[PDB]
Amino acid sequence: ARIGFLSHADMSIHFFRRPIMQALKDMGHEVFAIAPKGNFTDELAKSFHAVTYELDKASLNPLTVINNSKKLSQILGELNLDLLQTGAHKSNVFGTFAAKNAGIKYVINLVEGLGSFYIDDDIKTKAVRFVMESLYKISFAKADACVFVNNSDADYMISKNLIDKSKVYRIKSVGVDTAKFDPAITQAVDLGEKKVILMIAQAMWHKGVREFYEAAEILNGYKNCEFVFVGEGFAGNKSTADESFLKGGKVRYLGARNDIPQLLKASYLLALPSYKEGFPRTVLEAMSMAKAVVASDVTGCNEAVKDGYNGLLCKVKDANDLAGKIKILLDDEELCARLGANGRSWVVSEFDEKQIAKRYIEIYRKFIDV
């Protein structure tokens, strides 16, 4: 009845875990949102028990990551948790070690994307990938189960004998609030009289930001289109576009936004030229808003978008092919609407958050009384 949700970032708790956490709260359980201080901490803290901790999120310095995970073990023990749900690599691995050193009997892991350590292929990153996968063998062994939001990550980690099928649970996508993301009750943002080509993402190079911006240059307002980017940059980050880049192209930059349903309602299609995903939630949000998607033919994207059904797949690291798929849909409105309609139909029947949350709780029921 004391269930914590550990993440390296409060955004995962607030956007992804939330439906699970709200379901458990409603059932009368005490629910903990464990993540470093961020932009959603204050909001999270009036819905659940917010707990913050110091985390060097990207650092790979052993002593930093050891000291950090010792402090986290203490922070976690003070919560007297019955079960901990972790998410993503650093929480899955070091969060599990910390949780077990803290006396938490049950730890459920979650993989929602393999990350940039499977995009980059340099020798340094290949070494880091090997260590992480070696530690996963241990954390997965100490943990009781791991949920996977797509099939490819599960297949892969199984193929590498990192985890036994017995513990693999496949719950496709983290779900989307299809009653909130509902065209009929949403008033579009006013972005003009243009065909808005919308990309929602943190400005990671590995999200395809460069390709989205080059594709904007290539189409250059074709058929009265306008590329729009929603998300945050970060200065002094090799892995990220700075605001100067995000504002300096044939793209309208809106920064961070909370009116995503309204922005999607204003848009003509959603683009996600990611280098790698798990089950992208912005794609789900577009589908729920009955909007067609053009996404990269990469892990995750190619499970959330079926080419010719709810969207079009384009080659990765290829600004011209991304522009081509967008042009195709600009050239054929009746097709673009048909794909969006298929997206809305697919999400309502398989990806509404409420049933997805109930399936997580059925996994928890295996170990604790809810």
* Residue numbers at the binding site for ligand UD2 (CB under 6 A): 15-16, 112-113, 149, 174, 200-201, 230-231, 256-258, 260, 277-282, 285, 300
Q: Which is nearer to ligand UD2, 104 or 136 (CB)?
A: 136
Q: Shortest Cβ distance from residue 285 to ligand UD2 (Å)? A: 5
* 362 marked ligand binding residue: no
Do residues 191 and 279 touch, judged by C-beta distance below 8 A?
no
* 129 marked ligand binding residue: no
Q: Which residue is closest to ligand UD2 by CB? A: 113
* 233 marked ligand binding residue: no
* 112 marked ligand binding residue: yes
* 217 marked ligand binding residue: no
Q: Shortest Cβ distance from residue 246 to ligand UD2 (Å)? A: 12
Q: Which is nearer to ligand UD2, 139 or 282 (CB)?
A: 282
* 285 marked ligand binding residue: yes
Q: Shortest Cβ distance from residue 38 to ligand UD2 (Å)? A: 12
Q: Shortest Cβ distance from residue 153 to ligand UD2 (Å)? A: 9
Q: Which is nearer to ligand UD2, 281 or 344 (CB)?
A: 281
Binding residues for UDP-N-acetyl-alpha-D-galactosamine are 112, 207, 257, 277-279, 281, 285
Binding residues are 112, 207, 257, 277-279, 281, 285
